[PDB]
Amino acid sequence: EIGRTTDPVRMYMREMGTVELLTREGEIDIAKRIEDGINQV
Amino acid sequence: ARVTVQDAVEKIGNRFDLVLVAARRARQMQVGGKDPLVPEENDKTTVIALREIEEGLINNQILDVRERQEQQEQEAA
């Protein structure tokens, strides 16, 4: 479908649109996993 | 001469050859310190060269012979 949109801004927004937000639970989940990795090392 | 240069061209041939020959002769007169063959009559070196060429005194062959003789004499001493 790509209409050869050479505009880099369009490519950036198209790439970033895929990943979806998640709040109040993930942040805690990922922070815990980061601290766990650091504690392991 | 002063007005029209037809006779010199007729004497030598090409206009371009005329320009080159008369230029080297005029340089000779101006800076080399030679003596004009024809009378001054209050003329620039350019027109003196053209009048010399006009009446058969200066020509490429004659200039070459003169220069070779001068070089030969200079190297002799």
Added chain:
Amino acid sequence: ETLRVDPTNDRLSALVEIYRMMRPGEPPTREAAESLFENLFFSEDRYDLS
């Protein structure tokens, strides 16, 4: 004859066609196409025949 050549079928496909003609390279969501068409020709602050 124009209908026979016309590829789009319903309203929504037509809006999608216009949307990807005006802004090529972007995904044509419902709301985006709707807003584009309205603001394009029928909105007070974006069109004026004095």
Added chain:
Amino acid sequence: EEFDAIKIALASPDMIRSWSFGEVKKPETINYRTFKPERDGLFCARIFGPVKDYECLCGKYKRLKHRGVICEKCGVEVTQTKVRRERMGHIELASPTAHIWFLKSLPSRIGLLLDMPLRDIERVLYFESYVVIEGGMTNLERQQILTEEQYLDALEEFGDEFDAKMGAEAIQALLKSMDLEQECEQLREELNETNSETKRKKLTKRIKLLEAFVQSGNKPEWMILTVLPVLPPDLRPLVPLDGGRFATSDLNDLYRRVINRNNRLKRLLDLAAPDIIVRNEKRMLQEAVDALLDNGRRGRAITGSNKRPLKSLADMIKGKQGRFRQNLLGKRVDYSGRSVITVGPYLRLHQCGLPKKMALELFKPFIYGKLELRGLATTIKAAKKMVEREEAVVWDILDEVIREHPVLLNRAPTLHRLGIQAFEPVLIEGKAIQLHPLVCAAYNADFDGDQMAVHVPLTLEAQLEARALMMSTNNILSPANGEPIIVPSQDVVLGLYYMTRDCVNAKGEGMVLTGPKEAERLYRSGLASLHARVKVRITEYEKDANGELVAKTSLKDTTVGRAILWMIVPKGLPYSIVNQALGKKAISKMLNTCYRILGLKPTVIFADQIMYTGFAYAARSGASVGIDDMVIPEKKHEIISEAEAEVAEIQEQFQSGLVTAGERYNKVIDIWAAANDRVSKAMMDNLQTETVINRDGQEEKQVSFNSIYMMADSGARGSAAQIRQLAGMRGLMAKPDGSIIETPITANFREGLNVLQYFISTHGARKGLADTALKTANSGYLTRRLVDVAQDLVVTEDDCGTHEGIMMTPVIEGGDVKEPLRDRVLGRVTAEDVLKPGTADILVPRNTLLHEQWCDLLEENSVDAVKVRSVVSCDTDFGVCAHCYGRDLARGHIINKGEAIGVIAAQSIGEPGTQLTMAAESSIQVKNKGSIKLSNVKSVVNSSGKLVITSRNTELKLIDEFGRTKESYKVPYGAVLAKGDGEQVAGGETVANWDPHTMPVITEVSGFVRFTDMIDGQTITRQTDELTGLSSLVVLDSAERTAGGKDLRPALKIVDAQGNDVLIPGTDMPAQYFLPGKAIVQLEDGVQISSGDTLARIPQEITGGLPRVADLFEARRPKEPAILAEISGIVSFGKETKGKRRLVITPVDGSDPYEEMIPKWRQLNVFEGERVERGDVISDGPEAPHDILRLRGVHAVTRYIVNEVQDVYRLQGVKINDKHIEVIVRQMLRKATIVNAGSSDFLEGEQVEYSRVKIANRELEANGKVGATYSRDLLGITKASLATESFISAASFQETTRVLTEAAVAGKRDELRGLKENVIVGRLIPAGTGYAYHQDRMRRRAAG
């Protein structure tokens, strides 16, 4: 220092580091308080050199003790400042980046090497999809695009053998791995099996690229950048404006953002970021590099701070305002001045008046020098102060300096070479330059506010060639055509006309005078008039056999004025020149005669004296213009009223319905045109010869002395049309675009127009004015293209020794002779003499210049066709010989070796461009008496005893008593004639008759007619008429033919009572008259047709300006080209396919059948198998030059182009010698294409220079071997100029980026032959004075 050639090639990264003096790491430029440069910024002193000469920042290593030594502490080397103009830097990119020029500039070289469509490289570079570098496992291959998820699918399964990459790294890895030799050989093999024309040519071009790319030594890897160079600071300055602000070039900005993105990419990679972020950075870096190298080609141009796009490097090279045209081919100049011009009539032909102030300024240093020589000033500063205070000795010195020193006068636009001329100065006061009146025509100058520029030649050689080549007394003939340019004009002509004209009895009839001196003494004492008819004793001189002047004395009948004028005329000319009332033509002819008899110097002096006398006597005449001088016919209102009443009655008759709109409109226009002509003729009759004088007795009638009539006759300024507007009617006008208004303007300028008539005339006024305004630009562009194509031409040899030529005949278009020979052959060299033993015993010796005398001989012997040596056939390489050229029109002799022909030709053709704009066909009627000679005629006698012609090309002529052609005509096919060949026709007679809106198939014999393969309903239609009941049969074509009647080809059998057809004697052809479709026979089947009757009736029912010549020279293809017969033999139709008309020519002797597709709706002139030859026309329409060249040959295309260009100029009365158009055509046939395997390194389909092929071919034929076979191609002006063997010439011309890319890839080498090349590099051109110099360097190639 000294060099020989310039070469271009790609730059390897190590090369770019080789240029560098250090790498630039920070984007800083200068410090904000102390404006010194920063440590590693864009302006560092360490890498680009020191700011101030011989002084480092600390200054510890100073006083020129350390030369080249680097002061370590401040890092600043102690040398000159100029180095900041030439040292370069570099930048090491974190990720390889593609060079835009080799990616987008079509055909996209990167695409050609890898054989990938462009969009695929695009999608790879912008990180949108993967690409497979190396599939060792058989699943995948090289150059296969992999989508995002597809790569995951292939990796998870296979892995560890799967190389896929994305972005510029991938492209560089692809190029680095690809081996050229393999594909070279593979494609060489592949062309050997199958040649699909499209596939064949694309493979040829790709093989060409690979072979050249291997030869040049470049490697494809280098098309992608890893190191990027940085231009020296002083070519992108950052300078302080006086107001405290700073001015900067845009390259500073573009470089800064490239450096910023690069630094941040390094930071990102060092920091281990997620992949989407680094992909973003990589794209932005690539975009920044693209915007640096060429802005806006990547789609969206980066705009500066203001609103506008930043201007990048390619922008600095390309345009009309790039380096090439604006600073290298033409540049601003010292020692020059400019001012308004004014007429000085007292000057001699070689002088110009120069203001004192301009002269004082221009010749400044000369004055300083001679002030020091004479001791009047000790030092130069004293000389300055002497000059600025203008002491008297300064003026004396200046007068001594300018003497004998010529200056150059120029007026822009410089259309032709006479726009720059050298004059000798005369110092005047005032501030305007004084120009001699006679040279205005050459300059196209008028004294109403123009300005001219003055330049000073400096060296001795410059002075000499200003005096010899450029002086105004050397330019009296034009180089375009041979006619003189010094031509007396307005006031001069009026004075000479008034002085010469004669009058009845006025003072001093019939006195007898002892020569002109008494005539002057009489006239100036008031004892006689200038017009008296008197008898004067005159002595002419006449040049003898050996140049002697014989004197002859006689008693002539003349006037006082002519006697006085005779005192000027140099001795040698006849008296008959002066003895008639002189106009403009007479004066110009007088000068021309004096030139070709006496020489140059007498004509110069004579031209001056003519000017002086003309002014003097024009002033003494006191001619003036009052309003009573515009007389109006006494019977104008009668004509107007009659025309008005007649138009009123025709309009009244219209409402009876007897007259339609078109009838009424045409009738009214015709009426008003007739009335206009009657009014104009009555006005001229009343005006021109209206003076009745008593001749000592009764009345007499003579031409009038009306002042406006004088200005008309003399050719001074007026014309007939202007006077018509002043005194007759103003005429008919046209609506804005085409239509001509019905009611004309009946008033004239003496009477005054009214509101509506004025408004009507304004339309045409503005249209014409806008036309000129917007036509000048097209003229300029055309002449620029012409100059660039043909610049390399210079006369190089003396005699190529060729035996070719062009046959030339006088142009006999229509009825009247457009051009005789003497205008068309004068001054050309005859090759392969034409002898006529017999009637004329014609002897023309070989290789002679056609003087006037030889032309006179030709006229009196009355020969018509002569073969003449021509430039297009010359055999010299890289030039033309003197002999194939002919005269040097401006000078008057055989042309000198070393003169620049091409520029002269282009200028002479392009100069008149500005003044260049923007049906009773029943039978053939002979104008004058003569004899008929037909040529190429197929005749058949009918029962009526009238000659019927079936030949396609039949030409009618008119041989006179002396054996010349006076008329020529084109007899159409199937036209009935009146008389046969041989007898003398009479003036006015009609010789041919045919149906205009019909092409009839004419019968030859009688008998019974059988309608074959033509059924009603399938092939024809029933047509029923009224009570009379006359039916007509009309053949329907296969378009509407039913499926059952498709194979039926209509034909007419001509049978006798027994049916047997008698065969034509000797010939075995069967009488099978298969008439093609729509053979409309009104008479039904079984009707006796007489011989000569119509069988079928098929009916048959121009830019011309500056665009016309622009299209002729550009070799554009007409939209509807006539088709030509390629190969002789038999012609037929074949099997139609989808309606594709199928044309099969099988040769009579040749075996190979040749097929042509034909468009459906186009008609065919020929019916069936005929004897059609090479390039026999078969369809109707404009003809294409390409086809002419392929079929007829080179001489044909030259003749075609010459004729159809010259028509456009003749229609405007512009005279140009054909030689120049021949030169342009020569330069326009430069290339050839090879169809053979020869012995040399050529190929199928290559395009190479014709000269190169000639050299290789003659070289091999000196060794026995057989060379390749070629065919010349014809290319337009722009193509041919863009395809030279030199990238500097082409690059300066047009389309810079494309030609630079091709040259860079192919590794070209420029050898500096042309004139533009040497001009750019600052050298002596290889033409004229410089010629000798280069030839010396040529022999230096012998000792190397």
